[PDB]
Amino acid sequence: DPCQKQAAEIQKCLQANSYLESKCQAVIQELKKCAAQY
């Protein structure tokens, strides 16, 4: 599929970082780049 792994790993990352998106923005960059591909 497009990026469901990235979405799951973004959730996982946020969960592990108390929803501090800033620690998982590198993974959101990956999701954005993924989305731009797919």
CATH at 13 = 1.10.287.1130
- Specify whether the CB–CB gap between 31 and 10 falls below 8 A: yes
Query: What is the distance in angstroms between the CA of the first residue and the CA of the last residue of the chain?
Result: 8
Domain tally, the chain: 1
Q: How far is CA 9 from the centre of its chain?
A: 6
Helix ranges (DSSP H) in 1-38: 4-16, 25-37
Q: Alpha-carbon distance 15 to 38, whole Å?
A: 26
* Closest CA relative to residue 8, chosen from 29, 26, 31: 31
Residue ranges making up the domain that contains 28: 4-37
The crossing angle, in degrees rounded to 10, of helices 4-16 and 25-37 is 170
